[PDB]
């Protein structure tokens, strides 16, 4: 039942950013107004899930950028053995699926794709987790279902460690 | 310019004891932390190895992803009303053995660190190297490559990828 008739690419000028509605105006507007320009500037890189038949149709997207957190915010399961210093991460700044395609596994595939992409980059430049600011309790619970864990004093901000993500990629044959 | 060296990720074969850049904190980092931090993923360290002795470290640098709050970055323009970060890579360490200093190895490793981070940023973002200078002397060294201080921290500098890419493209490295 999982939707797989799509392919991943960097956001580009040919893609239909207007005909996307994930149900959250802020994410729709980011795709419309900011994703492509930010990608070219380098402030955040956005990747789209494109329909295999209509290559202009965006089924979903995610966006990443390098970041860091102070030691006080990081749960000990991640910071154990690292010393009392800033923790390098990648922020998953955006993740969205078009409402017409939701609940079909595309969000899960995109989260794992983002994690794989950041893990690969971290082999060159460092980083140990994805940092996620969840919009609400429901979204927070969605990320917790993949092993993301809340920051120490910010319950809606989560860390999904590359250790957790690597194990999930392994168990699902996605390495 | 000293060029009889090659670059590798820090590993178990390299001689981390026989290295002295004249700064004890940086020697101790190389001895105690560089390799373990590389394997843990908190910072990646790359060494300049003598072409005649693959265990001999002449210099090294270390990098990691980071972010800076808008308020620290000169000229940071916002697309929203809320708090935002400028995505960077920290150049956490840069050092050259005292016997090899003044021969352009530090400059070469700075450009190598910039190249490596620019290439990663093509996948995952980032716009500059962030450098915490040890003192005024080191601060001026980085300023010699166009590094600009943060707004309220004169010893912390940003070296834009715009600057680094121009040099690497001109020299054929990118
Ligand atoms: C960082 C931020 O931007 S936070 C804001 C996040 N974005 C939004 O809230 C925008 C609005 N919502 C959306 O875009 C989407 O609904 C998302 C991204 C939240 C969810 O993605 P969707 O594609 O809608 O749903 P999802 O990918 O969960 O599809 C469910 C399938 O994924 C997989 N899946 C979901 N959760 C799990 C899990 N915990 N473990 C294993 N597999 C899972 C399964 O295959 C599941 O199908 P099944 O439960 O029927 O077997
Ligand atoms: C991030 C941190 O860790 S801050 C702490 C920095 N590290 C230290 O302080 C440790 C102790 N010091 C050192 O390890 C070294 O002395 C360093 C890294 C500071 C300098 O590296 P070195 O290899 O000693 O010096 P450097 O690479 O500048 O050698 C000079 C050559 O570099 C090149 N170079 C240096 N500055 C410039 C410049 N502004 N523009 C162009 N080329 C330059 C030139 O080729 C120059 O040779 P020339 O002036 O004879 O033509």
Author numbering:
A (entry chain A): 0, 2 to 175
B (entry chain B): 2 to 175
Which lines from the publication concern this structure?
We previously showed that TacT is a Gcn5 N-acetyltransferase (GNAT) toxin that controls Salmonella growth through acetylation of aminoacyl-tRNA molecules. TacT acetylates the primary amine group of the amino acid on charged tRNA molecules, thereby blocking peptide bond formation and protein synthesis. A third-related toxin, TacT3, showing 28.3% of the amino acid identity to TacT, is conserved across serovars. We show that all three toxins induce the persister state by inhibiting translation through acetylation of aminoacyl-tRNAs.
We obtained the crystal structure of purified TacT3Y143F in 1.5 Å resolution. The fold of TacT3 appeared to be that of an acetyltransferase similar to TacT. with the exception of an additional C-terminal alpha-helix. Similarly to our results with TacT, purified TacT3 forms a dimer with a comparable dimerization interface. Examination of the surface electrostatic potential of TacT2 and TacT3 revealed a positively charged groove, leading from the active site of one monomer to another patch of positive charge on the second molecule of the dimer —features also present at the surface of TacT. Accordingly, for each toxin, a single amino acid substitution of the predicted catalytic site responsible for transfer of the acetyl moiety to the acceptor molecule (Y137F for TacT2SEn and Y143F for TacT3) completely abolished the toxicity in Salmonella. Single amino acid substitution of R88G and R94E in TacT2SEn and TacT3, respectively, abolished the toxicity in Salmonella, in agreement with our previous data for TacT. TacT3 appeared to be the most potent toxin, and comparison of its active site with that of TacT revealed a difference in the orientation of Ac-CoA. The adenine moiety is bent and more engaged in the binding pocket of TacT (and the modelled TacT2) compared to that of TacT3, most likely owing to the bulky side chain of the Trp142 residue present in TacT3. In TacT3, the adenine base of Ac-CoA is further stabilized outside the binding pocket by a hydrogen bond between its amine group and a carbonyl oxygen of the Gly145 residue. It is possible that this different conformation allows rapid unloading of coenzyme A after transfer of the acetyl moiety to the target substrate, increasing the processivity of the enzyme.
